[PDB]
Design a protein around this ligand. Structure first.
Ligand SMILES: Nc1ncnc2c1ncn2[C@@H]1O[C@H](CCC(=O)c2cccc(C(=O)O)c2)[C@@H](O)[C@H]1O
Ligand code: MET
Ligand code: SF4
Ligand SMILES: [Cl-]
Length: 380
């Protein structure tokens, strides 16, 4: 009664070896395990096969093998802050609480360029490396507005990296400006855009996208705007909204499109699964998937996305425990709101995040825009 304890005790390489020598493991799971040992790409039908057949333990062996081969114990997080230009939107995403169908313009606010600069200036004494800019799409927040803001932010703090806006936003403002995607992203980069976050991906396949995100930019337009960014030397992230009404093959379709794009242009850094949460949206009725399904999803993302450096977990949207366990199922990269401020006159701190990473035996690296170390907290 120590067979399972023996398995759990094995290093990463030997766990993979043990699974390959198990006579009772189905031939198809072995063949995928051998592909991972040989650094061979997993095909679409193999991806769907993992989702529909592979257990958590098996997926851990393969995902953690790939994660440790690429990163060892390195677990990355950056020091950034968020500006939300508006919390109302012209689109109707069924999963989103900003949908024009459940939130009128009057419940909401709209920042001016002055307002965004006043928020940015509050961080002037923080060693933040990056600002994340995202929110609703509204017609007053146009190409002119965002180019004006990028120029002011770059003149005020030239070394602050601007990770601003998704293809959902760029499709809208380029179409209104009458700019091609290439010319628009070129213009925005000159004004001071540095990279795009991975938002607005949802699920790409029309069968799902028509039902959860009908009106905003489609898969073709999302991938095309990332292509133009990559051709201009910009790095970008990619997301996938999972655990709602999609089938497993929709997730593999989504990752397959991302993987081909990455083969063409190579500018993706991180793939960020986003777990559907059924609070405060028109998908209220839709049941959330289990923690086991979240961990299997990170694992298959690590296995499938062989040309993406980083699998990233957004800590805000999941339990502490799921975030921590994800670091053993393919995740090397963490996004959170780091908040180290002392409340003078009466939130995840760096110390709390460093402790969560060390608790599951990982090396917490605070990283810069190039994913190089600012502080290696394993030596602190
Ligand atoms: N109910 C929901 N349940 C789950 N997800 C929801 C819900 N509502 C909205 N979202 C998601 O938020 C995204 C925008 C945020 C985003 O992509 C992001 C976040 C952190 C880091 C980066 C990065 O690139 O570093 C990008 C939307 O596209 C949507 O898919
Ligand atoms: C706040 S949602 C993320 C940004 C953009 N509105 C999108 O759907 O892509
Ligand atoms: S576009 Fe982005 S913000 Fe507007 S509704 Fe859809 S998800 Fe929410
Ligand atoms: Cl985003």
């Amino acid at each position: 009664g120590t067979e399972n304890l023996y398995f759990q005790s094995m290093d990463t390489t030997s766990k993979l070896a043990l699974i390959l020598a198990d006579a009772d493991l189905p031939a198809a799971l072995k063949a995928i395990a051998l592909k991972v040992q040989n650094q061979e790409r997993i095909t679409f039908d193999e991806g769907v096969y993992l989702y529909e057949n592979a257990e958590l333990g098996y997926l851990g062996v393969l995902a953690n093998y790939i994660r440790e081969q690429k990163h060892g114990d390195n677990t990355y997080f950056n020091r950034n802050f968020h500006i939300e230009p508006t919390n109302v939107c012209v689109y109707d995403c069924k999963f989103c609480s900003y949908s024009r169908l459940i939130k009128q313009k009057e419940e909401g606010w709209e920042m001016s360029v002055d307002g965004m600069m006043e928020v940015l200036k509050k961080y002037d004494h923080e060693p933040v490396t990056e600002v994340h800019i995202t929110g609703g799409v509204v017609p007053k927040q146009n190409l002119e507005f965002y180019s004006d803001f990028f120029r002011r932010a770059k003149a005020h703090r030239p070394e602050l990296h601007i990770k601003a806006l998704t293809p959902v936003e760029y499709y809208y403002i380029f179409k209104k400006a009458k700019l091609s995607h290439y010319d628009g992203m070129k213009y925005m980069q000159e004004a001071g855009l540095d990279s795009m976050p991975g938002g607005g991906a949802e699920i790409f396949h029309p069968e799902v996208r028509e039902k959860i995100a009908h009106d905003k930019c489609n898969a073709e337009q999302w991938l095309d705007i990332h292509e133009q960014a990559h051709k201009l030397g910009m790095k970008t992230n990619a997301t996938m909204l999972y655990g709602h009404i999609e089938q497993f093959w929709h997730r593999v379709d989504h990752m397959e499109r991302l993987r081909r794009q990455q083969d063409k242009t190579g500018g993706f850094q991180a793939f960020i699964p986003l777990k559907f949460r059924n609070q405060h949206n028109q998908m209220d009725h839709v049941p959330e998937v289990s923690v086991i399904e979240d961990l299997r999803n990170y694992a298959i993302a690590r296995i499938y996305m062989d040309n993406f450096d980083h699998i990233k977990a957004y800590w805000a949207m999941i339990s502490r425990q799921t975030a921590q366990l994800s670091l053993n199922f393919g995740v090397d990269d963490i996004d959170g709101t780091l908040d180290d401020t002392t409340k003078i006159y009466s939130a995840m701190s760096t110390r709390d995040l460093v402790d969560l990473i060390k608790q599951v035996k990982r090396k917490p690296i605070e990283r810069d825009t190039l994913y190089n170390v600012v502080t290696d907290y394993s030596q602190v």
